Structure formats: C-alpha cells, structure tokens
Amino acid sequence: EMAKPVLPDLSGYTTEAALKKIARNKPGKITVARMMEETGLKEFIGDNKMAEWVVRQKGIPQAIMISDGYVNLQDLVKKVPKQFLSEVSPGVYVARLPILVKETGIFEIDSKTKELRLSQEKGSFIVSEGKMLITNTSVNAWSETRNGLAAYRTPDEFRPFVLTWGGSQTWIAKTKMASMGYNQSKSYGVSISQYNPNMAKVLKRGEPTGWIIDSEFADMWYGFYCYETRDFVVKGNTYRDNIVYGIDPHDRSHGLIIAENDVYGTKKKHGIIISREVDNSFIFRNKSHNNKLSGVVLDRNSVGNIVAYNEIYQNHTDGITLYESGNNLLWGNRVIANRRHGIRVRNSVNIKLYENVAMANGLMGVYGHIKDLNDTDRDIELDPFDAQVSLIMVGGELSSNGSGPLSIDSPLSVELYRVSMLM
C-alpha cells in the first residue's frame, strides 16, 4: 500500500552545533531600566497592571536589559549591582529582577554557570526578543524564603518563567530547569511565542524559533509551550512530574520536531499535546508514559502531522487521543497498557493508522466515535468541528485489550487491511 514515513534528520541537533549559533565578537550593552519602557514587557503585562510588580520589587519596577551585541551571565554579574544579581557561591547566582534580552541582544549562559536562580519573591523571569543560548547548566525558579525550588502549590501563585517573543531564536542544551511557570498568559514555564495579534500587526517580526535539546524539565506548569512558532525542535529531553502538560505546542504552530523525549509523571493533564492548528509536524520516537490523562494528544484541527514509533504506555486515560484533528498519520506506535483506550479518535476524518500495536489497554485497542459539541464550553467560532469519524487501518496488531480490539461508532468510513487481532 503505502511507504513508511520519512522523518527529519536529528543528527545536526547537538550541544556542539548549538554553541556555534551566536555572534560573540561584538559586545554588549547592559542597562538596568524600568519595565514599562519596553514593548517586550508591556506585551504580557502592562500600566494599570504594574501594581503586582511594584509589590514584588518594593519600588518602581525595573529589569536587567541586554541589547546591541553579546553578553553572558558572568558579564551581567560584573556590571549589575549585587542586590539585583548576586553570586551567592561560585557559579551560583540569584537574580532579583527579570532579565530582558532585547531585539539586538545576544544572551548566553554556558558551563561557567553552575546554577542561575530566578527569585520568586522579587518576581524574576526571562524574556528574550533576540538571540539566546543556554548550555550545560541549571536555570531554576527559586524561593528565597523556602531556600529551595519554588515548588508548585497553586495555579495563580507567580513563579519565574522563560518566554521568547516573535523574531527571536533560542537554543537550550544539556540544561536542567525546574519549578517554572504558573496560570498566567505567556507565563506557563518555557514559552515560545509570536506577539499578541495586535502587536504583530505593527512589529511584523517573523515567527519565533529554536531548539530545546537534551535538557530536563521538572515541576513546570507546562513543560514547553508555544504559540505561532515555526520549525521548533524539541529533542532528547526529559519532562518529569510537570503540573498540567509535559509538552504543549499551540495555536497555529507548524513544522515542529518533537522527538526522542521522555515525558512522564504529568500531574493533571497530558504528556504531549498539540492544539489548535498545530500542523505539519512530527512526533516520533518519544516515551510518553504515566501521565494523569493521555500520552499524546492532537487537538482542535491540528492536521498533516506524523506520530511515529512512539512508546506510549501506562497513561491514566488514553494512549493517544485525536480530538477534531483529521488528516493525520499514526505509524508504528507501540501503545501499551494505558488505563483506557489505546488510540481514540473523536470527530476526525482520514486518520491513517498504519502498523500500530495496541496491547493490554484497559478498554478498546482502537476506539473511534463522534460527539455533538455545540452547547458546550467550546468556542465553535474559533474551533469549529464536524461530527464525523473515518479511518484507514493497515497492519499492526490489536491484542489483549480489556474491552476488545476495536470499536468504531457511526463511522462515515472504516477500512481494515491485514490487521492482526489475536484471540
């Protein structure tokens, strides 16, 4: 029938490749100015909204700013007052103001830094409108009160985060990060974003991009988040014990590479979820296991994607769930012992399920259904749907699931070819 999928070459995505991606030759200006002077800060916060930051800083709200050239952490440390950027032990720093890398800025943290602690109480965080590279180190949300990580307690309690804007480029490699992010726009944890639709009209910057490679993310509100992002690469990472999602690419992102990640322990929702027109992307060779909800989710008209060769096991609901995201290819996933269904397809058409293995799930191996979603929380205007399900199933195996190999309610069409179904 159909040839096996052609998946992107991951071999270029290297800490060594990464290090050669910035221009270090031209420094390097460092100011400490007021936050409200800067578009890159106004765009997720500000004036009638600066009260919280005045409280956190105990004074008129200020940021550390990098622009026109190159600055590393150690560079910042020397020029910025101790009260704001303090080295508490060799290689260990506490930032007590947010750090903004401006458009012409190039900011680097490398192996010279043991750990950079963002102060929770003083409301520290990182925003980059430009070039940023973080390699061989730790950047953690840090409670000065608790003398430790700003461990998660409640959704609305601020924690430090990393966010990047449109026009920017970001490479994180061999880096550890913990306890970042909370329930607040563009503040989810590590967030890659185009500008808010208004400001993008004016700035006309390109969609943001970069890599997150061989890094580890724990206790994040969302492990990864992105909005209108192009060609971002998430390879070789561990997402452990995060609060809401492990990896959460969003809102018209496209051409993404999410590969060879180990995503588990997600406390509230899914391991990996792409949502709202996340198209033409690749989710392959990932371990997504033991999340409170599903292993992998394609949601809200996310189309033209390839979910290939993923190890999806022991999630507390479905292994994979497709929600109103038609025209996707699931090839050769091993979907094993999830508490509910192995692969569930709701309101999606032309799903191709080739060579999947669905074993020992609590319910059906493969389950396809429809559901009228009109008088619900769904913004039918933003996220339309059509209550029809159709799928092509070729090869693979459905075995020892609790409720049976497959069940497809009211399908428009289902074709099955040479599928193994053991009794």
From Swiss-Prot:
The chain holds residues 69 to 492 of 536 of the full protein. Changing H250A: Loss of epimerase activity. Belongs to the D-mannuronate C5-epimerase family. Changing R300A: Retains 23% of epimerase activity. It comes from Pseudomonas syringae pv. tomato (strain ATCC BAA-871 / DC3000). The active site is at H250 (proton acceptor). The lineage of its organism: Bacteria, Pseudomonadati, Pseudomonadota, Gammaproteobacteria, Pseudomonadales. It comes from the Bacteria. Pathway: Glycan biosynthesis; alginate biosynthesis. Changing R276E: Loss of epimerase activity. The C-terminal region contains a right-handed beta-helix (RHbetaH) fold, which is common among proteins that bind and cleave long-chain linear polysaccharides. This is Mannuronan C5-epimerase. The keyword RNA-binding does not apply. It is an enzyme of class 5 (isomerase).
